[PDB]
Amino acid sequence: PVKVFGPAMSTNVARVTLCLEEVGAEYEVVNIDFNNPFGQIPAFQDGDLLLWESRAISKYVLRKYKTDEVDLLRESNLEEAAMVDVWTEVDAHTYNPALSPIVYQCLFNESLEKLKKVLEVYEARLSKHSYLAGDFVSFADLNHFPYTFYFMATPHAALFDSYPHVKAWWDRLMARPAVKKIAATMVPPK
Amino acid sequence: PVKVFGPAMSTNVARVTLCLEEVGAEYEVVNIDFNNPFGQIPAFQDGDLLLWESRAISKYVLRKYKTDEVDLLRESNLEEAAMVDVWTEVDAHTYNPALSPIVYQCLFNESLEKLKKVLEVYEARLSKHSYLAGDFVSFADLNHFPYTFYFMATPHAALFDSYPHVKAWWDRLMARPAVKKIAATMVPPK
């Protein structure tokens, strides 16, 4: 059984726990307090192996537990793997940064016009394909879950109704058993 | 022959051209002017395939042209691939951002104390291993080339002399024939 160290509700921990659930790995989430050379969270233990960097942890999980039924990187198919990589990068560089300040300014404390231009592109893409990388769910889709989840707790949630293919894609991810399981974990400690 | 569209000297184009040279692919670099749905540069054509996102382009290049002698992702070995991923992410999230404002404030126009703390970590890592992911060159090392190249044009270049293992690792990358070739291309158009 592998161990994830960090807060359950953080977007970087939820990205790893979502990957562990999609592949059906046995794992434990452990809270750690600061009181792994850059001392980052999440950290990840598998036997003597210690990893950090949410995306590197996630890919290790998706490769280690890969099957014919759950192949979420598609590394056996050059062009599928490329489309998974492209939309993973779009999530990191374009999408998550368009969401982030709406989430932060709405749940604590102009970005709407930039997000709409991004959703136009997603709407075109999800009109031609079931999921971002093609006609199969992949890491690219799962990477969109944690930030969109919090965006859907804001008063801007309904913005997705103007992008019917994006709304349908979002609802489809939200129906996945692994996504429902990780949604329920994304709460402050009790 | 594949085509890379963008400025030769940009860090994101040089990352792709360095990968194409390390695998010995036939390619052409094409300048494009704005006068690929988010219209990003570099863009990449391989037959009917059009890609964007420097890192996704790079990985497609490293997989398409992979051999026994030039395996720069190590996707066949779970833990090696994980260490390549970890240090690729360290480059994106920690290293390149520590260099960037030193490069920008020195060649145009506090970050030194943060860079030193990062170089301490790199020095420890490169004391135990030849290269960042283990005893083999990988994408993780190549990702460090473009920004470090520009950092070495600043008056802070000599900072690496305080980190002898980092200096030796840097000199070793600079001696690679592919790196020398791409260093020479990183000039303004003539």
B50: three-class secondary structure by DSSP: strand
If residue B22 lies in a helix (H) or strand (E), which one and from where to where?
helix B11-23
CATH code (residue A29): 3.40.30.10
B182: three-class secondary structure by DSSP: helix
B54 plus B124 within the same structural domain:
no
A61 plus A148 within the same structural domain:
no
Interchain pair A56, B82: CB under 8 A: yes
Q: How many domains does chain B have?
A: 2
Residue B185 domain-assigned (yes or no): no
Residue A21 domain-assigned (yes or no): yes
Rounded CA-CA distance A43/A49 in Å is: 10
Q: Taking an 8 Å Cβ-Cβ cutoff, which residues of chain B contact chain A?
A: 37-38, 49, 51-53, 55-56, 59-60, 63-64, 75, 78-79, 81-82, 85-86, 88-90, 93-94, 118, 121, 124-125
Experimental method reported for this structure: X-ray
| Residue at token pair 């307090």 | A33
Q: Taking an 8 Å Cβ-Cβ cutoff, which residues of chain A contact chain B?
A: 37-38, 49, 51-53, 55-56, 59-60, 63-64, 75, 78-79, 81-82, 85-86, 88-90, 93-94, 118, 121, 124-125
Phi then psi dihedrals of residue A28, to 5 deg: -130, 140
B16 plus B44 within the same structural domain:
yes
Determine contact, residues B44/B19, Cβ cutoff 8 Å: no
Q: The domain containing residue B121 runs over which residues?
A: 78-179
Interchain pair A79, B49: CB under 8 A: yes
Instruction: Calculate the alpha carbon distances from A23 to A56, A91, B54, B86 in Å.
Output: 16, 21, 28, 21
Summarize chain B as % helix, strand, coil (round to 5): 60, 10, 30
The Cβ of residue A68 has, within 10 Å, a number of other Cβ atoms equal to: 5
Determine contact, residues B174/B180, Cβ cutoff 8 Å: yes
Q: Which residue of B has its CA nearest to A84?
A: B56
Q: Mutating which of B12, B44, B53, B123 best tests the A interface, going by the most A Cβ atoms within 10 A?
A: B53
**Resolution for this experimental structure (Å):** 2.0
Interchain pair A85, B60: CB under 8 A: yes
B94: three-class secondary structure by DSSP: helix
Tokens of B113: 């104390």
| Domain end marker among A35, A51, A70 | A70
B92 plus B57 within the same structural domain:
no
A-chain residues within 8 Å CB-CB of B38? 90, 94, 118, 121
B150 Cβ neighbours under 8 A, 6+ residues apart: B11, B99, B103, B107
Residue A135 domain-assigned (yes or no): yes
B90 plus B161 within the same structural domain:
yes
A-chain residues within 8 Å CB-CB of B85? 53, 55-56, 59-60
DSSP string, B95-157: IHHHHHHHHHHHH---HHHHHHHHHHHHHHHHHH-SBTTBSS--HHHHHTHHHHHHHTTSTTG
End-to-end CA distance of chain A: 24
Residue B153 domain-assigned (yes or no): yes
A124 plus A60 within the same structural domain:
no
Interchain pair B37, A121: CB under 8 A: yes
